[PDB]
Amino acid sequence: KYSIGLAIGTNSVGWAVITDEYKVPSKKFKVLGNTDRHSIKKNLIGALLFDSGETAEATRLKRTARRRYTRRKNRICYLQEIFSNEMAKVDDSFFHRLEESFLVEEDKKHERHPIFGNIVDEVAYHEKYPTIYHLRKKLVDSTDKADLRLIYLALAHMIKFRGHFLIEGDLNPDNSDVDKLFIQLVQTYNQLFEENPINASGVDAKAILSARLSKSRRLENLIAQLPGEKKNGLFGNLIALSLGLTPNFKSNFDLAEDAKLQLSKDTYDDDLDNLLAQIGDQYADLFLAAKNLSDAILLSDILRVNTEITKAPLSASMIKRYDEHHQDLTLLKALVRQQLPEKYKEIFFDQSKNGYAGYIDGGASQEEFYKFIKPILEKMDTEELLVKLNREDLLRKQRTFDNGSIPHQIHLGELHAILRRQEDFYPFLKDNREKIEKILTFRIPYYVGPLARGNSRFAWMTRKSEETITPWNFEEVVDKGASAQSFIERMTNFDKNLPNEKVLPKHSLLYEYFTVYNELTKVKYVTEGMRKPAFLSGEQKKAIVDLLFKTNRKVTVKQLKEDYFKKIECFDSVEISGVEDRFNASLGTYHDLLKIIKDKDFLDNEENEDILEDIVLTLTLFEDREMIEERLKTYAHLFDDKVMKQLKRRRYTGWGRLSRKLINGIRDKQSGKTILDFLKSDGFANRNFMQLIHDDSLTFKEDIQKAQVSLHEHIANLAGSPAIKKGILQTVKVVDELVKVMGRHKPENIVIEMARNSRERMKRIEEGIKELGSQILKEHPVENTQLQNEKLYLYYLQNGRDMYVDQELDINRLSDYDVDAIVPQSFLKDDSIDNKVLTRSDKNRGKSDNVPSEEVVKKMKNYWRQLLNAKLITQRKFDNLTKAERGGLSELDKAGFIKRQLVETRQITKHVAQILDSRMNTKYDENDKLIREVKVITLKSKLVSDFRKDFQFYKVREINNYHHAHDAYLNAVVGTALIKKYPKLESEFVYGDGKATAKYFFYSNIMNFFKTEIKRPLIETNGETGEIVWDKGRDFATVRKVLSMPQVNIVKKTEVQTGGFSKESILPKRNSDKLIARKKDWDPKKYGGFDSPTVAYSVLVVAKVEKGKSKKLKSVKELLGITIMERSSFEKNPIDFLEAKGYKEVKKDLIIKLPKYSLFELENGRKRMLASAGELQKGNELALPSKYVNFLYLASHYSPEDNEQKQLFVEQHKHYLDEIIEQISEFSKRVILADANLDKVLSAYNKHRDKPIREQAENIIHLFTLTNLGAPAAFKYFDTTIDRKRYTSTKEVLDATLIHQSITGLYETRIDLSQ
RNA sequence: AUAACUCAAUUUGUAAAAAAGUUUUAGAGCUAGAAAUAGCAAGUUAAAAUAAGGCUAGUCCGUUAUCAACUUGAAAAAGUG
DNA sequence: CAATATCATTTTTTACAAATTGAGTTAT
DNA sequence: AAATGATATTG
């Protein structure tokens, strides 16, 4: 008797219930609470609306950082523990004055001067050490005994801001011998290149290299001093190396493969190896001369001082930045006094102005500050100050956005230095030097994570002993292995088939053997002789594997024929059937081990297997070469010191799909042969892995099917956005109430259907243009936000050049060229950067009816490549582009994509359909097979779109939140209709278990049976059953009646607010009540803090409150906003929370919980939704008539007969313009109550009545954002901006009726807040 | 529609780190002048907090997910038209 | 009161697993 | 990244 249609979005679930004549019922429903009404009638259509679900990511980023704050606090707390004993002797309360450094003098327990607890000393420290850097250096360099306090402060500053750990092992600054180390690179070259010596020539390398310009600038200016040596020359590339670049030595040496190196990458030693054994080991002394100059220059950018004058070249570089800032501020003051004194006070007094004033004492960035005085500096006479502003080096602060470069190794340098200096004087610095370094040095390894003890959901790390963990006991108390293993194993899959067993590493030698055989087992070959194509033999496979697979990393078909079938079966010709072009499967790990263990006969020897199957496990499981080393010691006794050294470096990542048991472990009872056996030799039926697992005449399928074995949990475990699994949950909870509503009778059919920047874009270009060698950036600069222009972005991802016709393009002309689609938008409704292309006109592509022509694919393929290489096109885009050189689009492929246009395949959507089927269908028949009482029909949103288009049931999202419902009812309809007509299409749309040309002609014309002509009968019917499917004479009318129905059940899901407590920004002090204490003890009148708390939810307090001096109790009803922070508290004692807010004799059993979007009905059926105890959003949907909806589509939308008939429905029904404004006004006036806005809106319309009919409709659409449900929002009529009329009080709600709604909003509880 | 391989792209989830930013305090401002107010001098650094907090007290946890009403439940979740 | 403007912590490195999509191979 | 609720300012 009935079916459901769902529309499942990320913000909405629309639903609808339909009967056999496509009618949607209308029932009377009980109405609870203390009201007038004991019932209502409710059309059985509606929506649920809801705020987007959100990802863990914010949550997690905030958590990982919380852990960072607490471990650094804890860094300091270690250092301090150490000084405590001997600091007591010097100063009684140093570490005290420091903690209360934040407190105002009034609240300070100790003297207001941190360091020396008086004025005269403190004032002096500062005069002698303006910065901590000045102290850092003095303590490092001076031999003099230093104040224990001054030592601690510098050790703390180094340990509090220790800089990154992105480099491994030790770093020893050598910035002096660069003018030699260059004259050594130049010489070992000139030696090798006997014929073309480079002229050292007293070129200042040290300056041009130790310079403050980009690596790619320093290369230009350094070969600029080398006569007739290009930077694309060998010496030019080598130099790019020494300046931590990635060059491509490939055309230098005449190779045919990317020989790019990078000294900082871990693979350099094995990339260099691959090159030097392509070009010769006479070129080793030239990558030694370029590693040599690298270690003196690695850190120019950061150190900027000769490491002859100091062992603290950082602090010194900062003292410099500082001194420079003195000299340069002195002069800049004077210069302004002279030439521009009129403005001086602005530059140095006014904070809001981005002057030096706003720099230091405002909020002005270096960049803003620098961007402000650009003009000022060059409208005066100075030259060197611009020099500096350009080098971003003008009035530099010591602490800045860019001290990120600084490795810890260099802080540890000075940290060490100092300790080493002062342990001469302080015995406790001697005996704990090593302790104090490891405070700086220690770091919990990412593969251990939280150091928990039972109360972390997050942690996995396992304890070797039950101590408190510390930087100095970590190794001995934390079992690092088991935790490294855990970090990985906990995430990696079990075998779906043997669910007890863990998946093998992707790079497992057996796995590679499995993978290969399973591909070798269906290879077929034919010769002029044999009457049929054969399978490979046991002995032939082995022979292939021996000679081809275990010597070529990659075996080609042209190697199968020429290197096996030729040389071992004397076949001049052969026809291979299983594999195309080359073998997917490869013995990669074999060849890698082969190189490293230099012993073939070991790998081959099947008794070693177990060991080689653990070696590779360990190479996958761990990534710390220390732990790999440890693991691999039990195999000391097999291979040289040198082989172990280069077996550690070898790492692997990735995990199979299958266990060791499944492959080579399980036996057939009959055969005592394993899957690996069956692949390796199955005589005559060279059977597959799929097969072996399904052939009922082998053991392997019962041996599997043996080991086999909540709603909210099930859905949150799917793979989608959490945004779209929020929808999946509600679409179920909806479908349950819609059953409950139909008195627990199950639909005959449920019809589901689901919906479908600038940073990462300039990184894709910048890099693409570099990894290409092209001037277009430096020649037409852009910015993050310009590239959002689709045509602009394209033009740049095509290096300012036509994608079909090698010739330049004019940046200034895009608006004349074409963004053509590769596979055309009449097959694939893909409109991403992957299927899109700028050309001066689409034509040039070739035929409109297919992929780009063989002409173009010829001419251009050389170009496209270079874009693939520059990552300025994906593999996918490359492959589609060129596809015409494999016949392009096959009549079939075509018919393919046009059935994909209506047949959902997206895995997330199948899981919805499966979930529903499995809840709807639970009953079994005599033969104990599932009975399917409910067909879950799934559609694409196209079917209905075109429906709406063809029969004019037009959709204008903007009007109201109704379409969500309409689509779900159109789904229910078309859905039930399609399968009523074409029962055979069940195979595709329903859940459960030459001809191309027709499949296409069919799937393209499926939705015909609705049309009267294209000639079809008025009444339609299933040719087989004789069942009526449609009736052009009275069904369309029922669609138009439903669509037009004015009461539709729209329902904002009410949500208690979660997340951050308030706005993060920490505001000054002010004498406000709004300011919130950043800590319990920190009165924000004195110390400032937080503002704008989020309201978790509002609460109706009726109570009494004291009024005036004598303390008369005045009664009050009002909403109190309970803040996220307050909630824990409020919940644990609602009475006490309100009492210590002022409230008294609170009526505890009148306290109504009011989440966000709580519904109230007021005076003229006017409704308002709660936003907060403090504000309301619009509560009313405006059911515009469909004759007005229809018009507004077409009007706004500028078949030629149809076209004429509809531009002449527009011109003839122009009166509707004034009529629609009216609907808006009667409404805006009745329920919106934005009088002054509404009279701008009326005034705005009246001035543009002389404007085109298209333009005016396009804008009457912007006017609906007045009348829209939810939060008031700003909008433009034409030019006129209409700012949002907000509802900033919640009083009128207190005397309204609260409406408690079901998901569907069919069952209600109405409460008349008259209390 | 399923399973294994291959290549690319994408998404979800986790851990370990870094540089800033922001907030109070500390860096004697000084000469007029009763005063409000002038002139001039200074500015780059640091201590500490970075969800309030929590008990399970860990170098842990503290922003995701889930949520009308009524009866039932610690809860999840059931029952009610 | 209720109109009206201003406001919102930013970024960066490393390490890892799982799904998913879509172009190919081989199968149930 | 908007947009929407907080907030101080304003008329």
XYZ file of C-alpha atoms (C1' of nucleotides) in Angstrom, chain A residues 54 56 59-60 63 66-68 71 74-75 98 101-102 108 112-113 126 157 160-162 325 337 348-349 356 398-401 444 446 451-453 455-456 463 469 511 657 712 730 740 744 907 910 1053 1056 1058 1066 1078-1080 1087 1300-1301 1308, chain B residues 1-9 11-28 39-53 56-69 77 80-81:
118
model
C 32.671 17.923 11.471
C 38.169 14.916 14.317
C 39.753 18.265 17.806
C 43.092 16.372 17.207
C 44.976 17.715 21.465
C 47.930 20.415 24.565
C 50.429 17.534 24.920
C 53.221 19.839 23.593
C 55.849 18.386 27.979
C 57.801 19.639 32.080
C 61.103 20.364 30.242
C 59.644 33.743 38.009
C 56.304 37.073 36.790
C 52.719 37.294 35.302
C 53.006 39.308 43.811
C 58.546 42.791 41.440
C 62.016 42.299 39.757
C 69.005 44.958 30.732
C 65.589 29.775 26.815
C 62.056 26.261 26.071
C 62.590 27.052 22.315
C 64.961 24.288 21.244
C 68.018 47.633 14.080
C 63.129 64.810 11.543
C 56.728 56.614 16.173
C 53.734 57.529 18.482
C 57.421 51.432 13.857
C 64.966 38.757 17.235
C 61.895 36.465 17.642
C 60.033 36.142 14.253
C 57.703 33.870 12.113
C 58.896 10.848 22.597
C 55.998 9.323 17.070
C 53.242 7.819 27.725
C 49.848 6.874 29.304
C 48.905 4.481 32.143
C 43.341 6.270 30.969
C 44.279 7.135 27.289
C 55.945 -0.682 29.779
C 59.062 7.791 32.686
C 54.023 -12.198 -1.372
C 45.631 -8.123 1.758
C 25.582 4.170 15.354
C 19.268 10.455 10.301
C 6.285 3.360 13.026
C 4.570 -0.954 11.640
C 30.477 2.696 -2.362
C 25.609 1.054 -1.576
C 17.376 19.191 14.245
C 23.309 21.020 22.108
C 29.872 21.185 21.693
C 42.948 36.832 24.641
C 42.003 32.794 31.514
C 42.815 30.989 34.855
C 40.801 30.702 38.154
C 44.960 40.538 33.616
C 8.856 19.709 20.666
C 9.080 17.815 17.294
C 4.453 17.022 18.415
C 28.340 -7.355 -8.107
C 32.542 -9.466 -5.833
C 38.488 -11.041 -4.933
C 44.128 -10.356 -5.955
C 47.903 -7.421 -8.691
C 49.427 -2.688 -11.171
C 49.579 2.812 -11.701
C 47.671 7.812 -10.135
C 44.778 10.630 -7.429
C 39.728 10.878 1.699
C 39.430 9.306 6.968
C 41.931 8.489 11.282
C 46.402 8.600 14.580
C 51.259 9.995 16.774
C 55.687 12.952 17.368
C 57.776 17.803 16.849
C 58.696 23.385 15.462
C 58.079 29.010 14.666
C 54.965 32.685 15.725
C 50.702 35.239 17.846
C 48.102 36.866 21.984
C 47.807 38.185 27.484
C 49.810 40.468 32.448
C 54.717 41.670 34.784
C 59.920 43.116 34.469
C 63.205 46.309 31.594
C 63.756 54.053 36.923
C 58.388 69.231 24.066
C 62.311 65.495 23.888
C 63.967 60.328 25.007
C 62.574 54.839 24.365
C 61.131 50.752 21.372
C 63.999 44.699 18.995
C 64.089 41.082 25.080
C 62.304 37.932 28.986
C 59.221 35.269 32.942
C 54.502 32.873 32.708
C 49.398 31.132 30.647
C 47.807 29.256 25.900
C 41.104 26.051 26.439
C 38.667 27.099 32.971
C 39.920 22.421 34.449
C 41.915 7.828 37.220
C 47.476 11.801 39.316
C 49.471 9.370 33.836
C 55.565 13.558 31.309
C 47.224 11.159 31.172
C 42.680 13.265 29.852
C 39.898 17.919 28.480
C 36.782 21.122 21.234
C 35.116 14.682 16.819
C 30.931 11.290 16.981
C 25.890 10.924 19.464
C 20.992 14.240 21.342
C 12.542 16.705 20.507
C 8.811 15.360 24.381
C 18.870 2.471 23.976
C 4.136 5.956 23.950
C 0.063 8.809 19.288
